[PDB]
């Protein structure tokens, strides 16, 4: 999970 | 930038 | 910047 990578969120930006 | 999303790197996995 | 992610990275994983």
Known sequence: N???
Request: charged share 0%.
């Open 2 to 4: 990578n969120q930006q």
